[PDB]
């Protein structure tokens, strides 16, 4: 129960939640410091070579 | 000249009470918003602590020092440190004040803002001096020392606006009211038995005639004739708060006009 059915995971974040009347129903506001820690592995393709190069 | 009109009811070195007539509500609101948030002012921004044996913290004392009102009459002759060509600060964009206090006596010795000494070259300007606005001649009670305690620090004052930090605001509460008789029906008065008996009459009700007690609602009337009272912290004269608020607002509209012109060429 403590290590197989549930476990601690990577690529996650926790903080206090606030209410934003100016966000869409499906949007979530993410603090900038958290967005810099969490990453997404994006594969290099002809459609994203330039954008990924600038990010690097 | 036949535009917005002004009538001053009460003038002082700390408060100016006037009636702003023949104006729009948007203009009146922008005037008070600019007077609160966008009039440049001189205030202590960085503090170097050399000795601090007081019962207060350095950050505690620094916050207090930044809230002390300094003279800002010639603030326009000063520059923004961000817009100046100097490493850290110079005489063209800053004023330097030193505070040296020692507990030489057995009784508690009080450190006031009158003890701040300007050690920069003011270059004949009229900025930097702490504002003394009391009877005894002292200023703000900065700190208290007992025997053997010392406070040694150097303050650097820069110009800014209350949008960056409230310490650069030259204005205290601003009174702003229109239509004291509620003839435009912009408020729906909460009451229990009778709203007229339950809501005290504004002092400005004496400058306007009451409703004619039975005439139809005037749907063509727009808000004007605003009653405003501007208070000043003393950094700049209260009359200058109004004048420079108009100047700041006028410049902001001009900047939009200039930016529009710059886009036209390209």
């Amino acid at each position: 129960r403590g290590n197989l059915m549930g476990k601690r995971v990577d690529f996650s974040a926790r903080t206090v939640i606030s209410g934003d009347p100016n966000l869409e129903l499906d949007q979530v506001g993410v603090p900038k410091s958290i967005a810099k820690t969490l990453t997404y592995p994006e594969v290099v393709t002809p459609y994203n070579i330039d954008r990924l190069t600038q990010l690097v | 000249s036949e535009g917005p009109q002004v009538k001053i009811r009460e003038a002082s070195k700390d408060n100016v009470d006037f009636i702003l007539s023949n104006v729009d509500l948007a203009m009146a609101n922008s005037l008070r918003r600019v007077m609160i948030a966008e009039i440049p002012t001189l205030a202590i921004d960085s503090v170097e602590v050399e000795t601090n044996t007081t019962v207060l913290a350095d950050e505690f004392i620094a916050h207090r020092l930044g809230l002390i009102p300094l003279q800002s009459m010639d603030i326009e002759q000063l520059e923004y440190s961000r817009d100046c060509f100097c490493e850290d600060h110079c005489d063209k964009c800053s004023v330097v004040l030193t505070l040296q206090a020692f507990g030489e006596s057995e009784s508690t010795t009080n450190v006031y803002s009158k003890d701040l000494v300007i050690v920069s070259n003011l270059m004949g300007r009229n900025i930097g001096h702490p504002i003394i606005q009391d009877k005894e001649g002292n200023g703000v009670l900065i700190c208290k020392l007992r025997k053997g305690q010392e406070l040694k620090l150097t303050c650097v004052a820069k110009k800014g606006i209350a949008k960056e930090h409230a310490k650069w605001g030259p204005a205290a509460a601003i009174e702003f009211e229109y239509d004291p008789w509620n003839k435009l029906k912009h408020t729906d008065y909460w009451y229990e038995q009778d709203s007229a008996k339950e809501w005290p009459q504004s002092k400005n009700c004496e400058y306007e005639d009451p409703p004619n007690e039975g005439d139809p609602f005037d749907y063509k009337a727009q808000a004007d004739t605003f009653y405003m009272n501007v208070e000043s912290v003393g950094s700049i004269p209260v009359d200058q708060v109004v004048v420079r608020g108009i100047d700041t607002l006028q410049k902001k509209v001009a900047s939009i006009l200039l930016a529009l012109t710059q886009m036209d060429q390209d």
Partner: protein, 56 residues
Amino acid sequence: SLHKMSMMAHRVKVIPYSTFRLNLSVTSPYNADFDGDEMNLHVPQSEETRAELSQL
């Protein structure tokens, strides 16, 4: 997280400050308020789970 609406997929909006921000209408499915509640964020790591998350 007593029911499946307590885990829902949102679109990221990177923002200033240190709190998560969400629309008011999604507070009832989460059984959440803004008196100090904290919520968890999980980032998918592949195109499979990334489309799965946004399509289900």
